[PDB]
Amino acid sequence: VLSFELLHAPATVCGPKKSTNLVKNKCVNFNFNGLTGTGVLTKSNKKFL
Amino acid sequence: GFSALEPLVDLPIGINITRFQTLLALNRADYYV
Incomplete structure (x- = not known):
């Protein structure tokens, strides 16, 4: 049961x-x-964290 | 000097918290609140 x-x-489950x-490189709904x-969407070069 | 604090955890505990105490260890200029 x-x-x-x-x-x-x-909530976590x-x-x-x-x-x-x-x-990539195509207009899409993300x-x-x-x-x-x-x-x-495309490849970027942002130094994220 | 300036140093930003990056996040580590995000615990979805969701409980009411009003007090806070720091534990110690044993050994055989800290504790800034």
Whole structure:
């Protein structure tokens, strides 16, 4: 038996969140890690952290 | 000197916290709050 409760608290257990192969140099609708927008993706040279 | 603090963890504990105490060790100019 699996029990589920809908309470206002930080959630950390849910599905695998299936992904899709990224497309570079083509205008696509991206959904990276919950963000969403329309644009073209390409390789950058930003020294991230 | 100036040194930024980078994040390490983000624990979704979600509990009420009001106190805070630092533990010590044993050995056989610190603790700035």
